[PDB]
Write a protein that binds this ligand. Structure first.
Ligand code: GTP
Ligand code: MG
Ligand code: MG
Ligand code: MG
Ligand code: MG
Ligand code: MG
Ligand code: MG
Ligand code: MG
Ligand code: MG
Ligand code: MG
Ligand code: MG
Ligand code: MG
Ligand code: MG
Ligand code: MG
Ligand code: MG
Ligand code: MG
Ligand code: ZN
Lengths: 180, 842, 52, 137
RNA sequence: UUCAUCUAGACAGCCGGACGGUGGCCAUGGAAGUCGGAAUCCGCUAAGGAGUGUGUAACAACUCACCGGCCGAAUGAACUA
């Protein structure tokens, strides 16, 4: 029964003629159940030392997984970030960008300025909903994200920091090709 | 600052456009009844000297030493202005002297009755807001209460002296809190303000916000500062007074204005608000609290000081109190925002008319109200009734919207129940004296136009709480003016000595008059109950009773609760009692009534004075019930009219018509005081199976049928699994979403269950309704308040009766421990007579 | 109102802890036994209760 | 673009609808057009823009099997349990399950169906847990 | 003393994911994993329970199992005296 899954991840051996190595930095499981609709880890790095050929093994550490489709190797290179994470943090997270906001109406009902006041943002009410005046930045590059500030952007005001679905390298029927 | 004249104020009541009918509004210890003090100085009344703490609209002696306004006392004031200021009125105006009709108001939730009373007779509102405490929970509720009758608000952010000293605040954050406040104040407006104005939002640059500390004596607004300093830079006011609020700065060494934070290439520039509207004031705190006196004068002189015969020999913090009151005196900021931005009676009655009219909202008088017409038939609402200063006799306090009112004038008073058609709350007597009011001294005036608030001595024999008196035959009333607190906390009042009772029953009548929603009534259980809106509100109402209205010693007690004796079985045996005269016998069983149909007479569909053949027909079909057993009914009970009935089920029996007299007699002695504990009963039917009457007559009187029957039915009661019906309230509360969880948390500890959970659109403001057993309901409202942070406003009414699956007859159970003590207190014994007595086993 | 960032910072020192069920002592939130010997370092530890 | 919950016949609303400039009465009466075999718990969907009502009916997988039962029912006249599970009608189960957006990352036409039949929660449906390696569609 | 996991990479620690049918059916004024009862099934799967905690009025958003990362060599649990 762990018989069964030693045998399973060595189960689908070679199968194909060209491939693509990828990374799983901050990507959903719903975000994966998407890509598999289009058809077109260390228990494996010894699989190759076993069934040998290739010397492609120095490319693996971090959260890595694998794809296969033999069609034009850039015809698939476009469903890559066809997914577009733009994950708005979990409940508060780290600062990978430089924060800012500008004026405009927000179309939200004026009962949510509760968050606004918690960050020293001047606000007024017009046309019925929350317009913002005199826009400012929350705090500097690489600094604090309060549950206040996150709680504001994260779900109130869709304005995230993208955590894309990337890809590192590829073997083109015998040797490997860095980028596009 | 000099007091002017009784009939001089009478003369400007004619110039309606210069009248300001408004109130003050804030959360409890926010500074308003001291704020008012600073204005009646600028009308003579109070000494400008150490008379800024004996707050005058706190007329009451307990209002004065508890330091909280209790009743919404009132005062009208005469005021001077300068022509330079009286141009900026976008409503027709007349001269340079105005009359402010104000109500300083209590701001506890228990007293929201006094503020809704204060608003209904006013057009404007001045909301006070502590800087430190900001906008607390009651501010939001009394803001809702103003827009509820469409009042225009203007704000003043107060006790900013707390901001400087206790909070060691810098300049920008202090501004930032001002920003933080005004933002949250307008989000209240954009939800409840009537979507008929829009212009009712509040912003400081538009001159609808002030800043100060009414205790220390001073206030300002950006407009009062706009002119004051635009007179030297020679530049304008309009675009200038936009540059002082918000992100717009100046940057000296560059000498031209800015747009956004602008940074000035490192360490940015401060808002016009900071170095140019507060750099004066902060230096006063810093350079006189830190005692820099050698700096004090020539810094005093840089910014236009003046001293006194004692104030120069008076340095910091008693200095700051004394210098800044002279720097930016209070009324100047206030009169500005009140005369400029608050609606005169004519500019206000025209949109509050149609909604404030009981009859057709275009009635011939509502016309003359919109016009603020002082010549129509007199049209006036009395909102409160205020103690006389003699023994218990009440001016009536309202505002008139049409015609005039003269001392000695015949008038029809139309109470809350009147319609123009027939005999209703219509008394037709005259007014002894019209009189306009101050800090309880009133000044008799003989004639008063429309659009002003006044008193009225000569009535209150004819009013009970509120009323609307007119001069036209068919002038409809005014809408009934419901407040957000309903009379929920309640106790029973008995008089300590046995004979003061007459003084106690007039006191309740006199008490009902005083507070707009104190209730007093006789209960089914036979008590005088005095109900209020909070455990605190009830305190004062009884203080006012034990001393003034009743003036006798009386002690209070939780009210006794009315149960009913009922059945839920069909006689675990049959039943037979005999007589003293052991010659006659009755046989019967007793069964429960479908609670559906016991209602059917409680709602008056089956009655004794009516006739059967219809009694029979109705009950048979739909009521899981018989057709001929609904013909041979004999009587109701108790009181001849109650929901416990009898019918005949016996064979060719001896002499039933000459005891039908005496069987209903005993039936009535059993239905208002039965077994378990002698309360009235409901929902049990009794059917008679055989009867053995003696012969002759005198061996069958009432004296032998009624002692058997009352005996012979109690027997049939305890057989049929006796149960008691506890009374249940239907309670509705309006609560915001935030603390809505505190409602369900109390409802189950107090054994409630919700019927409907719903929200008002846009509002948070849910309104949950539930069934509350009154047994588990005492102190409930006060504990719901703490469970909600005061953000809940319950409103209870009786709904129905309910049995209990806990068992009554056992004293251990939590439905028999209730009537455990019901006997001991009532004066009875330990257990309740077993069915073995009342049943002659033979 | 303590600003949310530091309401949780202090909450970590005062509110978010564990205590001993028979020694009453205050103990690190993840800790497994009590450090005080009077209770013989009993493992019976509850978390320190929190407010509202 | 919004969505609703279980409604049999009729339908609270304006807590979210009146603030959205919609006269909520014209929509709650119209919401009984997508809600009426057919009276059970079903999801809804409304997506409009500054106008009158525009609301649709969604493919609640729970609902399809319920109509595919003895749809004879009365509201509160039953008072026991909604054990309305009638004949599995495995073909109609497939048509509904096929119509279900071919969602759940549908590998097979049957990969969608194995989720539907697995709702032995819904009722008897003559056989709970149908076969595994069978014919397909 | 007994039984377990680990170079096919364990234990701790730190980091990424924690799905879809679907708010599953019973009921509930309201119960969407998280008052509760019963069906504890399935699909996509490197994996995710018809859901181990906080929380909501109900959702939310935080959480864990469960799946990978990083580190590379030993660790875990119930017991006895
Ligand atoms: N530091 C400071 N304290 C103030 C200021 N204004 C009022 N207070 C204090 O606040 C307290 C309550 O205010 P009051 O004016 O007496 O009455 P109110 O609070 O407006 O009305 P109630 O709801 O009936 O209590 C008083 O005891 C004052 O001492 C102020 O401007 N600065
Ligand atoms: Mg006084
Ligand atoms: Mg007194
Ligand atoms: Mg006061
Ligand atoms: Mg305080
Ligand atoms: Mg008196
Ligand atoms: Mg019957
Ligand atoms: Mg009922
Ligand atoms: Mg612990
Ligand atoms: Mg590990
Ligand atoms: Mg799911
Ligand atoms: Mg549930
Ligand atoms: Mg829950
Ligand atoms: Mg499975
Ligand atoms: Mg969730
Ligand atoms: Mg984890
Ligand atoms: Zn210990």
């Amino acid at each position: 029964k762990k018989a069964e899954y030693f045998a399973k991840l060595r189960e689908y051996l070679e199968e194909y003629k060209s491939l693509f190595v990828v990374g799983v930095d901050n990507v959903s499981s719903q975000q994966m159940h998407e890509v598999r609709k289009e058809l077109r880890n260390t228990m494996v790095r010894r699989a190759i030392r076993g069934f040998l050929f290739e010397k492609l093994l120095p490319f693996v550490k971090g959260n890595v997984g694998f794809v296969f489709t033999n069609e034009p190797l850039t015809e698939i290179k476009n469903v890559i970030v066809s997914n577009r994470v733009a994950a708005p943090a979990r409940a508060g997270a780290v600062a990978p960008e430089d924060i800012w906001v500008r004026a405009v109406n927000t179309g939200m009902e004026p009962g949510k300025t509760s968050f606004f006041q918690a960050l020293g943002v001047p606000t007024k009410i017009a046309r019925g909903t929350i317009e913002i005046v005199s826009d400012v930045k929350v705090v500097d590059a690489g600094n604090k994200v309060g549950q206040s500030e996150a709680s504001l952007l994260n779900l109130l005001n869709i304005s995230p920091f993208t955590f894309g679905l990337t890809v590192v390298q590829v073997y083109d029927n015998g040797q490997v090709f860095p980028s596009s | 600052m000099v007091a002017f004249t009784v009939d001089q104020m009478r003369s400007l009541m004619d110039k309606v456009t210069n009248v300001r009918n408004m109130s003050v509004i804030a959360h409890v210890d926010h500074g308003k009844s001291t704020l008012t003090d600073s204005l009646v100085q600028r009308a003579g009344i109070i000494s400008a000297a150490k008379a800024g703490e004996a707050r005058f609209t706190d007329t009451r002696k307990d209002e004065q030493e508890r330091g909280i306004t209790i009743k919404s006392t009132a005062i009208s004031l005469y005021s001077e202005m300068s022509d330079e200021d009286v141009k900026e009125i976008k409503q027709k105006t007349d001269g340079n002297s105005f009359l402010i009709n104000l109500i300083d108001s209590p701001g506890h939730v228990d007293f929201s009755s006094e503020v809704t009373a204060a608003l209904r007779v006013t057009d404007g509102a001045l909301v006070v807001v502590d800087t430190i405490e900001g906008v607390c929970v009651q501010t939001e509720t009394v803001l809702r209460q103003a827009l509820g009758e469409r009042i225009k608000p203007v704000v003043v952010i107060n006790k900013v002296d707390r901001a400087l000293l206790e909070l060691q605040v810098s300049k920008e954050d202090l501004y930032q809190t001002f920003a933080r406040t005004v933002e949250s104040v307008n989000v209240i407006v954009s939800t409840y303000a009537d979507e008929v104005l829009g212009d009712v939002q509040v912003y400081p640059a538009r001159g609808t916000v002030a800043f100060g500390s009414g205790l220390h004596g001073w206030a300002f607004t950006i407009r009062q500062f706009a002119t004051r300093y635009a007179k030297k830079f020679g530049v304008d006011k309009a675009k200038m007074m936009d540059r002082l609020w918000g992100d717009s700065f100046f940057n000296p060494k560059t000498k031209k204005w800015t747009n956004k934070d602008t940074d000035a290439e490192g360490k940015p520039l401060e808002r016009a608000f900071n170095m140019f509207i507060l750099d004066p004031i902060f230096r006063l705190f810093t350079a006189i609290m830190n005692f820099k006196k050698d700096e004090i004068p020539v810094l005093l002189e840089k910014l236009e000081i003046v001293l006194k015969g004692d104030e120069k020999d008076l340095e910091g913090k008693a200095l700051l109190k004394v210098v800044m009151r002279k720097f930016l005196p209070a009324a100047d900021a206030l009169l500005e925002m009140i005369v400029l931005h608050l609606p005169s009676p004519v500019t206000a009655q025209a949109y509050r008319a149609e909604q404030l009219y009981e009859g057709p909202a275009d009635d011939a008088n509502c016309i003359a109200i919109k016009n603020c017409d002082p010549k129509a038939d007199l049209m006036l609402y009395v909102s409160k009734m205020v103690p006389t200063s003699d023994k218990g006799r009440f001016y009536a306090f309202g505002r008139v919207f049409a015609g005039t009112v003269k001392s000695g004038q015949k008038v029809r008073i139309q109470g809350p129940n009147y319609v123009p058609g027939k005999k209703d709350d219509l008394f037709i007597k005259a007014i002894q004296r019209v009189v306009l009011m101050m800090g309880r001294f009133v000044e008799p005036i003989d004639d008063c136009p429309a659009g002003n608030i006044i008193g009225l001595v000569g009535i209150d024999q004819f009013l009970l709480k509120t009323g609307t008196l007119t001069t036209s035959e068919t002038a409809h009333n005014m809408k009934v003016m419901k407040f957000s607190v309903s009379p929920v906390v309640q106790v029973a009042v008995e008089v300590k000595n046995a004979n003061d009772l007459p003084k106690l029953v007039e006191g309740l009548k006199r008490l009902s008059k005083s507070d707009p929603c104190v209730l007093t009534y006789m209960s089914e259980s036979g008590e005088h109950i005095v109900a209020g809106t909070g455990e605190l509100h009830l305190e004062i109402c009884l203080q006012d009773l034990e001393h003034d209205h009743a003036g006798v010693p009386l002690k209070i007690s939780p009210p006794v609760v009315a149960y009913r004796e009922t059945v839920e079985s069909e006689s675990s045996q049959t039943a037979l009692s005999k007589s003293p005269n052991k010659h006659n016998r009755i046989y019967l069983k007793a069964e429960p009534i479908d609670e559906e149909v016991s209602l059917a007479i409680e709602n008056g569909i089956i009655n004794p004075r009516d006739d059967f053949k219809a009694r029979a027909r109705i009950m048979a079909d739909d009521y899981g019930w018989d057709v001929t057993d609904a013909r041979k009914i004999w009587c109701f009970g108790p009181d001849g009219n109650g929901p416990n009935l009898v019918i005949d089920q016996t064979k060719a029996v001896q002499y039933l018509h000459e005891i039908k007299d005496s069987v209903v007699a005993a039936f009535q002695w059993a239905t208002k005081e039965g077994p378990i504990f002698g309360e009235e009963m409901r929902s049990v039917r009794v059917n008679i199976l055989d009867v053995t009457l003696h012969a002759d007559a005198i061996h069958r009187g009432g004296g032998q049928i009624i002692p058997t029957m009352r005996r012979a039915t109690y027997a049939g009661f305890l057989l049929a699994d006796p149960k008691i019906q506890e009374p249940v309230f239907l309670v509705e509360i309006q609560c915001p979403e935030q603390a809505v969880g505190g409602i369900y948390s109390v409802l189950n500890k107090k054994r409630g269950q919700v019927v409907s959970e719903e929200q008002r659109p846009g509002t948070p403001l849910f309104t949950v309704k539930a069934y509350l057993p009154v047994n588990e309901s005492f102190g409930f409202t006060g504990e719901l308040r703490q469970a909600t942070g005061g953000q809940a406003f319950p409103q209870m009414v009786f709904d129905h009766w309910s049995t209990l699956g806990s068992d009554p007859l056992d004293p251990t159970s939590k439905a028999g421990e209730i009537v455990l003590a019901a006997r001991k207190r009532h004066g009875m014994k330990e257990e309740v007579p077993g069915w073995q007595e009342y049943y002659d086993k033979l | 109102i303590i600003e949310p960032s530091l309401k949780a910072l202090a909450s970590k020192y005062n509110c978010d802890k564990s205590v001993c069920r028979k020694c009453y002592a205050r103990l690190p939130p993840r800790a497994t036994n009590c450090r005080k010997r009077k209770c013989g370092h009993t493992n019976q530890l509850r978390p320190k209760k929190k407010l509202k | 673009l919004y969505l609703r919950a279980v409604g049999g016949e009729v339908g609270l609303a304006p807590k979210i609808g009146p603030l959205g400039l919609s006269p909520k009465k014209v929509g709650e009466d119209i919401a009984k057009a997508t809600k009426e075999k057919g009276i059970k718990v079903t999801v809804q969907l409304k997506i409009q823009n500054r106008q009158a009502a525009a609301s649709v009916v969604p493919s609640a997988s729970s609902l399809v099997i319920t109509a595919l039962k003895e749809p004879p029912r009365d509201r509160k006249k039953d008072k026991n349990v909604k054990h309305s599970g009638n004949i599995q009608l495995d073909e109609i189960i497939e048509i509904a399950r096929q119509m279900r957006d071919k969602s759940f990352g549908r590998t097979l036409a049957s990969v969608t169906k194995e989720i539907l039949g697995t709702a032995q929660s819904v009722g008897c449906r003559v056989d709970f847990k149908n076969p595994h390696d069978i014919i397909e569609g």
